[PDB]
């Protein structure tokens, strides 16, 4: 149960430095390689670089000039730094555990062998947006008079940039929860709504609390929903 968790800013002004960090849990950074990968909207995957736990680095040449990867075994994280940031650096950024394999296909002493790398454990990703713009109003969507199944939710309007995550009842309520993907306003701002379907029977004497987290502004909001 090794897990990898990316922490990002979500937003970075053009031509300043993007900083990322990946925290690994249920495992050690030691004896392993550690890679950063990114995916521009609608595009394929692009490997950025790796770092051996000892410090040795290796980079995609197309980005080598601006990129810096470092490791910290004392905290089990490794970091990315991308300078002179541009609009083409907008992407989801992944951190992934990297394995080094070796195929000995002949005599190991005639150099009849080679090494290879692959990524077996990935992080969840973190959205990086490059905009000059700066950086979420939550309103209750109250249940109303669906056959014993009742729908209520939270409306999250006018935030920037992506993403926001919503939990219900501090993560205790997970069934029937359907958080819809956000709209891109003409204004350019983002808006989503999250909805949970609960039993209509005894809808009262039941508390429903949507917990909205918007990391790019360090805001954690709770909102109670009742008829």
């Amino acid at each position: 149960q090794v897990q990898l968790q990316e922490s990002g800013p979500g937003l970075v002004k053009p031509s300043e430095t993007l900083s990322l960090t990946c925290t690994v849990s249920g495992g050690s950074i030691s004896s392993y390689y550690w890679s950063w990968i990114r995916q521009p909207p609608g595009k394929g995957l692009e490997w950025i670089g790796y770092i051996y736990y000892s410090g040795s680095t290796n980079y995609n040449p197309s980005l080598k000039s601006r990129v810096t990867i470092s490791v910290d075994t004392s905290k089990n994280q490794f970091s990315l730094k991308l300078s002179s940031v541009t609009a083409a650096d907008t992407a989801v950024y992944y951190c992934a555990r990297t394995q080094q394999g070796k195929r000995i296909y002949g005599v190991v002493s005639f150099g009849d062998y080679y090494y290879y790398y692959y990524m077996d454990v990935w992080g969840k990703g973190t959205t990086v947006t490059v905009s000059s713009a700066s950086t979420p109003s939550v309103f209750p969507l109250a249940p109303s008079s669906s056959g014993g199944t009742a729908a209520l939710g939270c409306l999250v309007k006018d935030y920037f940039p992506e993403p926001v995550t919503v939990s219900w009842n501090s993560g205790a309520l997970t069934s029937g929860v359907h958080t819809f993907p956000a709209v891109l306003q003409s204004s350019g701002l983002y808006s989503l709504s999250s909805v949970v379907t609960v039993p209509s029977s005894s809808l009262g004497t039941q508390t429903y609390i949507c917990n909205v987290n918007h990391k790019p502004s360090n805001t954690k909001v709770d909102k109670r929903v009742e008829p």
């Binding site: 394929g44 995957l45 692009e46 490997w47 290796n58 995609n60 040449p61 197309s62 992944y94 394995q99 394999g101 195929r103 080679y114 090494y115 290879y116 790398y117 692959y118 990524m119 077996d120 454990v121 990935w122 992080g123 969840k124 990703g125 109003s137 309103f139 209750p140 969507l141 109250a142 109303s144 669906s146 729908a151 939710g153 409306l155 309007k157 359907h178 819809f180 993907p181 956000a182 709209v183 891109l184 306003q185 003409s186 808006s191 989503l192 709504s193 909805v195």
Partner: protein, 211 residues
């Protein structure tokens, strides 16, 4: 080093899908496959030509020989729809790490499903902020294509309508949302409002009235 992938492959459910990875003498290399479902992070499904990672269904089978590496998926399910990327590490290259362009797997012939629609009126809290927004939520539909029409007391409206693109749900159906902002002066003005969702030659309509 160049990895050539077809941009898309289609299969009927239960059939076998074959995603190929072209390369020059690629059989002399270790090929690894990644699966990326919509909205999700990639996962390793094959490493070193044919090795199965922990938890990867026996339906997935990697193979590599000659100038083509192949990811075979037997008994394909709707949930297998994803982008599949082959990957290699070619030591003798300025670009040592290579990804394939990616192959989109689409499962054709899935069962039709009618949209469920839920229309919320402007909240009691939003109206004191002199803002008013109608939220229309569309879910559980397939194919993932719907047209949305808003009506203001039997009168179609185009102004202030923001609709999303359909996204895939975990149950391999689709969801989409449509928004209509108004003034409280506009909201309380009319006797009702209607979100009208057309799907596959049929329409579901929901109506809300101020009180």
């Amino acid at each position: 080093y160049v990895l050539t992938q077809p941009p898309s492959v289609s299969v009927a459910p239960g059939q076998t899908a074959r995603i190929t990875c072209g390369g020059n003498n690629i059989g002399s290399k270790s090929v690894h496959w990644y699966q990326q479902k919509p909205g999700q992070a990639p996962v390793l499904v094959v490493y070193d030509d044919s090795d199965r990672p922990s938890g990867i269904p026996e339906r997935f089978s990697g193979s590599n020989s000659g100038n083509t590496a192949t990811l075979t998926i037997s008994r394909v399910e709707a949930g297998d729809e994803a982008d599949y990327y082959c990957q290699v590490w070619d030591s003798s290259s300025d670009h040592p790490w290579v990804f394939g362009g990616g192959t989109k797997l689409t499962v054709l012939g899935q069962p039709k499903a009618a949209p469920s629609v839920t229309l919320f009126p402007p909240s009691s809290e939003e109206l004191q902020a002199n803002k008013a927004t109608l939220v229309c939520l569309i879910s559980d539909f397939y194919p993932g294509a719907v047209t949305v029409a808003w009506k203001a007391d039997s009168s179609p409206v185009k102004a202030g309508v923001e609709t999303t693109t359909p996204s895939k749900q975990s149950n391999n159906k689709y969801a989409a949302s449509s928004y209509l902002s108004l003034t409280p002066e506009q909201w309380k003005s009319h006797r009702s409002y209607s979100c009208q969702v057309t799907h596959e030659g049929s329409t579901v309509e929901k109506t809300v009235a101020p009180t």
